[PDB]
Design a protein around this ligand. Structure first.
Ligand SMILES: Nc1nc2c([nH]c(=O)n2[C@@H]2O[C@H](COP(=O)(O)OP(=O)(O)OP(=O)(O)O)[C@@H](O)[C@H]2O)c(=O)[nH]1
Ligand SMILES: Nc1nc2c([nH]c(=O)n2[C@@H]2O[C@H](COP(=O)(O)OP(=O)(O)OP(=O)(O)O)[C@@H](O)[C@H]2O)c(=O)[nH]1
Ligand SMILES: Nc1nc2c([nH]c(=O)n2[C@@H]2O[C@H](COP(=O)(O)OP(=O)(O)OP(=O)(O)O)[C@@H](O)[C@H]2O)c(=O)[nH]1
Ligand SMILES: Nc1nc2c([nH]c(=O)n2[C@@H]2O[C@H](COP(=O)(O)OP(=O)(O)OP(=O)(O)O)[C@@H](O)[C@H]2O)c(=O)[nH]1
Ligand SMILES: Nc1nc2c([nH]c(=O)n2[C@@H]2O[C@H](COP(=O)(O)OP(=O)(O)OP(=O)(O)O)[C@@H](O)[C@H]2O)c(=O)[nH]1
Ligand SMILES: Nc1nc2c([nH]c(=O)n2[C@@H]2O[C@H](COP(=O)(O)OP(=O)(O)OP(=O)(O)O)[C@@H](O)[C@H]2O)c(=O)[nH]1
Ligand SMILES: [Zn+2]
Ligand SMILES: [Zn+2]
Ligand SMILES: [Zn+2]
Ligand SMILES: [Zn+2]
Ligand SMILES: [Zn+2]
Ligand SMILES: [Zn+2]
Ligand SMILES: [Zn+2]
Ligand SMILES: [Zn+2]
Ligand SMILES: [Zn+2]
Ligand SMILES: [Zn+2]
Lengths: 184, 184, 184, 184, 184, 184, 184, 184, 184, 184
């Protein structure tokens, strides 16, 4: 990512909207924004293999594992405005379990991109499926979207839930149900 | 609508109920009431096609999407008093997903009319079924009614829930149950 | 109701328990008590037909309608002490829906009598059944009883739940479960 | 109040906003609206003396009495839209105390009119002052305004607090503070 | 208390309100009602010295003791309907402290009578003052009144707070303030 | 604001960060972002006189008026990332009161700019002071900043409170205290 | 119960633990302790028929009756330390319903003994079964155990749930489930 | 403590209340009870010097240190029944601070005895004073008493607050207020 | 455990991280750390048979027993950082029930080791199975992991749920569901 | 720091406590522990000047700025066990305001060391006083300590509050009080 190009773009952005790029508090803005967006889009430049590291251990049992409340922050591809909340993950191992924090690293890998919540849940679930090959994976993403809060419809109480169910989580309704019950 | 006729009716309404349209605080009231009512009934003059704004994107998955807590305000056709609360929407796509904000715009289109809560839920669900042609749609409307609170029976703790299920949400019981669970 | 007789009975009631009907704070008590009981037992003198006063409209859909949290106050026939709480009503129409507030008026008609909570739920459900002839009706009553709280066992944390299920609410387990779930 | 004239105005209102007065659901609306508004403005036709009903008793002590959480409903004189919430009353008697329910009756007398929240608090406080001539009285009104929620700015989380302090509540900082502390 | 006369009065009461004194469920009601009222007015027949049972001990220190949340139930002398809630007591000893449970026994002594909340607070405070002769005592009574909820104004959200401050609690602003702060 | 120039800038922004501006979901992004920023910076192009309209009425009393919970959304001038929360306003009128919703319009006027929370509170307070010239104004802004949540320090539980006190709110500590107490 | 022997045993107990049986504060302790234990074990000396007092009435309907939140206090037979919480009771009548307060009297009968929570649940259920011979009865006991909190493992956050299901509650999965759902 | 004697006393206690020391569930009870009481009265046998075990460090500053929510369990000397809750401690050092956990060890030293809540607060405060000789100490104890809950008055919502203020906490009203505020 | 060797390792640890072992505050740290770790790993040195202490009793019934909220503390074997939360246990006896506190003792035996949450749940369930040979047992562990909060991903809102189901808890869907429902 | 030496010490630590460094799950533990501790003590190697990053801007007003809820994690120098919670910062500028995020960076700089909570508060406050030279600064640290929860006294409900007041926050009592009020 060319930071110099972003700085120039952000500098021109400031004047077009009616601001003074030469103003005290805005002098370092173009630079700050460039770095911000480099970090906010770093997910595209990450590799699932490096993200997971070697944190794949032998299964201690065959029971469901649920990692809930993994906060996430993303940017809607439609308005380039933040949407955020939490990701809840559930899975039944076949023979391998993942290091808990790796779930969070996977979430960040896909969240730090321009997204749509429906895709985020699917990519997270697919990544986990690919790394562990468990009996099944379930991913629930719940977030608030600033694009419909600070503009447009300006709704305030709304929240969106998207999900992705693979393997036994898609097959056995009782399994999916038990996973969703743990979230309430 | 004819604002001049509304203003004249409102000015007379003030007189009949025992008020003084000449009062300082009531001088601009007939005008404010006319504009307010034009806004509160604007839903009758909206077109579903324009409300959607072509914000129909290709489905990212087959899993249920739930847009909950969309606050709404409406007027009961029986007393012309407000009833409000929230609208919860759940659906399973069939190659098409809607822009999140459009759900809120569809809600406002039907809420900004004289209504009955049972109808509001059906119309919202049918509008979503027409725009997107998903496997199913589920709409739950929960509201409090001022015509039951500030007059008549004067009940204070009551709340009404109405709904509409289409496609798999009406067919598949486990699907409906899963949608409802997400609301608790 | 003979307000004059209730007034004389109340005056003597004051004397027998060791009070003085002649003291300033009790002067108007026999009259106040008389009027209070006339109101508290008014349910016996009401007619369902008049309570509903029409307000029966054609159904807008086939989905369940849930009117929850209708507060109620009644008197136990055993001790003549208040028991109160909330009444939750659910029904699937068969071509006819009821005006929301009429549910409250029906609740009051039966609550404003000497009661047994188990009976109250059944009578409310049966009244709804007669008026709408819906596919099914479900009524849940939840209340605290002063005869259990301010005397006798003097338990403080207890509350009682009673209900009545008719039509499809009795026959269809899933319909009943869906109704009860909307209450949690 | 001329109910016949209100019904006529309401019927024309339905036509002007774009609705059909002939609709089955709107046939009885003009009558319902007329009756509703007569009730919603009955406060103008009430008399403080009749509202109190001589329920003024000898003081039992010289300590503060606080009647909190008296729910109220009113109509803003600016838009004729409902604003509602609760009224909290505090006072220190000077030989005379008021029947608790009379505070509620006084609240309703001034609430069932076209109002501005600032005035509602003042009139309630002055009414109490006139009736009891206490050492002091304080009134706090907290309400949500639909004209700010259903339209205009459409803000959702806002609430307004207005108050009126008389006698010792205005003159004694500690007294007022003690009263406000009771409300938290 | 003449239970026989109460039973006769209650049996006639059932007749006057329109009920059937002979039906199975009301056969034992006059008897249950008589006993209930004997219990509810037992406070008139109790004496402070027997209630305290000599449970007065030497002060362990000089700081205030606060006994809060003592639930109480009483009957308003105006309507003979229950009012209930909690009593909070605070006092600074003057060489003597009271057995904690005796505060509850004192509350019941004055609550189990026909009362006015303002008086209940004062009497509890004076009973404590007499038994311990402390540097000061403060009593706060908070309750809901059924005569305001199940009839009349029918307000649902209101609660009334009354109090009585003696000695240092009345004269020392900071002492009273510290006491009230413990209740929040 | 030149929307065409923003569209071109946003288009180049998309490719520099590593995205495909020709991708289905990003085709209309440059346009959507342009409109978004025009709206998000519209505050600079508003006039306080037009915002307030003519909503200045005579004072109903001299007591404090508190408008709390006015939600707001803004953009930090440092990172061009959203920060949001609520604004609480309190004032003691000298002779004029403001229309409640105008407080919200003033908040939006200054919030829809590139800001720093410290300045936002001051500008809001100054605007109100200028329009009403009351005895004093108090403004409290509380918000969460995405720039320290979704990046940088990545703190999650943090909230920032900034304020501005003018007139009696700056002078009398007791007044400022009473205002802040209403907020808790 | 031989109170004299209890007093002697308690006086010796005070001596053995190292206290002074002669000090002012312990002089009446043996007496207080003896009386307390007579009360705490009074359940052994009670009989189901007298506890019920013939308060058995004809069934008003066929739906389940749930009496929840009946607080109870008992003593574990293992350490003679208190365990307490709440008992929830549910049953489907077979022509007979029980006076609500009798459920509480039955709970106390079995609680005021040396117990094991598992047994307490079973005995309450069996007592109800015997008195009403209902289609089924379910009892859930939830409590905290001081022998686990103030000594031994000293865990602070634990609570134990025990239950007993008879008739249809044991055999009908959905009936048991509906009962447990009412408790949540 | 003579465990053997307590064991013999406990065995006879079981017999006199109507139980059977020989039944399976009571076989090891006399032994369990003996050991429990040895632990519950261990506070008498501890020494402050050893409880603190050094752990006194030089002060890092002059500001108040508040250790709140230290759970405690004790036994009333009046009924030998548990009373428990929390102890909150506050102090301003004078060159010396205490190891956080030592506050808990001191609490237990005094709680594990036969007590009076008023005394417990004073003894804890005095122990802190002797160990640190701070500028001031403040101890607040809040607890529920089983002798008031499971017998006697049987009140359920009550809790008692007792305290001890030494040095600047007694002398400086603002310091005391600041301490108490940190507790809310 | 060689405490002397641990102290030596801890002293060198202080030097290597950059601290001064000679500091007044760190002089006793090696000793404190040594003792702490001996306690934190005491679970390896415990025996299930001694932990249970023969506290196995004859079953009082055949219904489920649920011991919930047993707080636990452990150390992740991966980073040697604490992870903690609560353990919930459910089981249906087959003639034998366990002393409630023994569940807590079993939890601690396995928690006070280096662990992975998935294993902790399994070992607890197997331990119970071995001791009681019940119809089934279910264990749910919910914990927060400092290695995910203090470092690494630094996620703040996340919590992990692991479980183990044996016998009827694994084989009977309804049984497991009933157990999980009790936890909500 | 020397990671190789930390790894060697950690590998030996595993052996001494009774573990097997050869275990699959412990193979990479010494390495993970070394890196973790390097990160957890990185605060010793940070420079305040670099932490601020020159993010000191001109003051927008003279009103108090409060940055609350900054979560923090630290290690106690006494047991090398984590203690964590939140840090609340309040200050009144003197021509200079700090970038919000820098407060969080200052917190981490001092938290990521071996600490005592009393010191942490002072160092944070002194760092802010040096960077910005405001009229005053106030810092409140609230945390839970694992060395008190997972070992030793094993108290579960305790929390410790420490603070540091500089300038007007130490001088002006009303200023300190206002800052503390904002935290409640
Ligand atoms: N099902 C349904 N009923 C409604 C809605 N809004 C609304 O006012 N109603 C009901 O319409 C009915 C009209 O009753 P009515 O013709 O006797 O008029 P009324 O004003 O005397 O009724 P009320 O005093 O009981 O409120 C009321 O029972 C009212 O509750 C709604 O959205 N759905
Ligand atoms: N201050 C005070 N007033 C009380 C108490 N209990 C109680 O009923 N009152 C009041 O006594 C008054 C009696 O009024 P009233 O003689 O006009 O009788 P009413 O039944 O027509 O009054 P209502 O319908 O407004 O309740 C009521 O305002 C009632 O609220 C109490 O504890 N304290
Ligand atoms: N102080 C006060 N103002 C009120 C009350 N009710 C009420 O509508 N107002 C205000 O009256 C003003 C009328 O403003 P306006 O004459 O420009 O009419 P408008 O409909 O365009 O206002 P809006 O769109 O901002 O709500 C609004 O700002 C409204 O918030 C009330 O109780 N107290
Ligand atoms: N199932 C069940 N167990 C109980 C109840 N009350 C009660 O004390 N217990 C258990 O009875 C057991 C007696 O154990 P034990 O004979 O080894 O005595 P102890 O005092 O040394 O046990 P502890 O220190 O673990 O509490 C404890 O595990 C205790 O938790 C109860 O109501 N139900
Ligand atoms: N399944 C499971 N994983 C655990 C537990 N405790 C624990 O640290 N882990 C995981 O063990 C893994 C070790 O990963 P790693 O060898 O790459 O080391 P790391 O320190 O770089 O990991 P990190 O920075 O992502 O936390 C982490 O992903 C961590 O979340 C536990 O109880 N269960
Ligand atoms: N004031 C203060 N004391 C602390 C902090 N962290 C910390 O461990 N301490 C205390 O340092 C003291 C060290 O006590 P000690 O030398 O007798 O060691 P110990 O492990 O046997 O103590 P313990 O078992 O009571 O926890 C403990 O009382 C502990 O609570 C802190 O941040 N501030
Ligand atoms: Zn968007
Ligand atoms: Zn209506
Ligand atoms: Zn009864
Ligand atoms: Zn308005
Ligand atoms: Zn009354
Ligand atoms: Zn920023
Ligand atoms: Zn026990
Ligand atoms: Zn006692
Ligand atoms: Zn770890
Ligand atoms: Zn420590």
């Amino acid at each position: 990512v060319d930071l110099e190009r972003l700085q120039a773009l952000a500098a021109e952005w400031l004047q077009v909207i009616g601001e003074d790029p030469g103003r005290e508090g805005l002098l370092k803005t173009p630079e700050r924004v460039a770095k911000a967006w480099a970090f906010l889009t770093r997910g595209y430049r990450q590799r699932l293999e490096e993200v997971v590291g070697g944190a794949v251990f032998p299964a201690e049992g065959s029971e469901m594992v649920v990692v809930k409340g993994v906060e996430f922050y993303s940017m809607c591809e439609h308005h380039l405005l933040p949407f955020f909340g939490k990701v809840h993950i559930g899975y039944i191992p076949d023979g391998k379990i993942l290091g808990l924090s790796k779930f969070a690293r996977i979430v960040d890998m896909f969240a730090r991109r321009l997204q749509v919540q429906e895709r985020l849940a699917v990519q997270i679930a697919e990544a986990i499926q690919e790394v562990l090959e468990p009996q099944g994976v379930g991913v629930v993403v719940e977030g608030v979207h600033l694009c419909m809060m600070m503009r447009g419809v300006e709704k305030q109480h709304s929240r969106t839930v998207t999900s992705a169910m693979l393997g036994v989580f898609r097959e056995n309704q009782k399994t999916r149900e038990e996973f969703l019950s743990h979230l309430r």
